Amino acid sequence: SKQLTFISAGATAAVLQSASAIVSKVAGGRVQTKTAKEAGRHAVVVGPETPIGVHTAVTEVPKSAQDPLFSGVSTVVVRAVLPRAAPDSVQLRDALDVYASAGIDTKEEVRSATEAFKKSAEVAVGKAKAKGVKRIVLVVKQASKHNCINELFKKISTETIESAGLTTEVVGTAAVANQLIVNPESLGVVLLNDVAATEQIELAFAGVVGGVSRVYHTVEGGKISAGHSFKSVALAVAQELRELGLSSEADKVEAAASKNPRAVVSAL
Amino acid sequence: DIMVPSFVYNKLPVIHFLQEKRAEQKLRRVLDETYTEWTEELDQAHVTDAITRSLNI
């Protein structure tokens, strides 16, 4: 009756097959599992690549799945995701910086980027207010190539955050990544500009913590789960089942993920 | 038969000269207002740069 939408973005067939087996064995057939390329709700996206239709890429440190090394840490990493076009077409993150060099008009693209950053900034400040932190950390790659997209990102993110009344501290990519992996307790909320390096940093943090499920906020309004490994996908499915209104099944999947990461399907 | 013909004959040379000058003026205008237009086309280096960015390099 109900439907779970599986999106594949750069994920090996093994992970997708594992996810399908897990849901089928745990759900028992009550909720069907359909595959697609875009969704707004009841969706799990498998693979490092960012799907189409997501504007925010928040990720946290769930208490249940905290690795013993990272016990007690509490930091929220939100990556701003610009609208994604077809693979052949030039992405906005690159168009916004190359067209300016070429002299082409960049009004509509700036407007679209501004809207995406505002939504991401609103999500970040809401998380910061909920956690109670007073200052957030913006992350912008300091490469000369990305001298326009980051500039707009800073101009808008700081504007929205200052309007909300919180402080912002701008930093690069290498220093923040090292701090987040080594000393993450000194960062409460970190926003990331839309760059490939930032995406890798978000994945590394999501994996080093012990394997977690990232939350994507879409344009339509909602939250969709995202994973890239067996454990992360299993946690993403468990959260998705919990959202559908299944508690016991979600707990079983979470327990199986904690015990046997690479073979949860057989473990449960 | 006599007068108007004579005055027309007297007019002819000046009018011929002025019309020749007018025609020269118009051809001179034809060539004056011709200019070679050099068009500018988007440099392919930017295209190559965008291609590289799309590759995620």
UniProtKB/TrEMBL annotation, chain A:
Domain of life of the source: Eukaryota
Protein name listed in UniProt: Uncharacterized protein
Highest classification ranks of the organism: Eukaryota, Discoba, Euglenozoa, Kinetoplastea, Metakinetoplastina
From TrEMBL, chain B:
GO cellular component, one term: kinetoplast
Superkingdom classification of source: Eukaryota
Keywords, comma-separated and alphabetical: Membrane, Transmembrane, Transmembrane helix
This protein's name: Uncharacterized protein
Protein's organism: Trypanosoma brucei brucei (strain 927/4 GUTat10.1)
Upper taxonomic lineage: Eukaryota, Discoba, Euglenozoa, Kinetoplastea, Metakinetoplastina
Residue window of the full protein shown: 58 to 114 of 114
